[PDB]
């Protein structure tokens, strides 16, 4: 039930419990209850995975079309 950033607890209640019944009744899958009077504390609290900039490695662009091979061996083309 708990262990996440937010606890929806199923659906948002429409005020109070109707049918004139207790909010606890029989505990089957629900066991957490909390009633407040006016607002709450810790109003500045959140959780998000922020990220500034995409860090990546740099690789030199090296190809086989280099003058070293042409100056070391004989270069020819036979298409």
């Amino acid at each position: 039930i708990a262990g996440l950033f937010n606890i929806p607890a199923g659906i948002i209640p429409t005020g109070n419990v109707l049918s004139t019944i207790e909010v606890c009744a029989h505990r089957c899958i629900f066991d957490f209850f909390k009633q407040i009077r006016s607002d709450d504390n810790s109003l500045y609290s959140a959780q998000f995975d922020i990220l500034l900039g995409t860090y990546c490695n740099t690789l030199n662009f090296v190809r086989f079309l280099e003058l070293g091979l042409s100056v070391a061996c004989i270069c020819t083309k036979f298409p």
Binding site: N6, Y44, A46, Q47, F48
Partner: protein
């Protein structure tokens, strides 16, 4: 981080000093963030 005597001996025997100035940063790096973006991201779940 080296010993004073060792660094003095090194600078007198082998190493040479040719520095007269330094570099001082001119950016404090102070910035602020608004919680509205975090709230909207949390209330949406998936965002770009």
């Amino acid at each position: 981080v080296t010993t004073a005597t060792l660094k003095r001996q090194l600078l007198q025997g082998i190493l040479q000093i040719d520095d007269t100035a330094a570099d001082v940063p001119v950016t404090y790096g102070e910035m602020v963030l608004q919680g509205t973006n975090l709230v909207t991201a949390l209330v949406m779940g998936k965002a770009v």
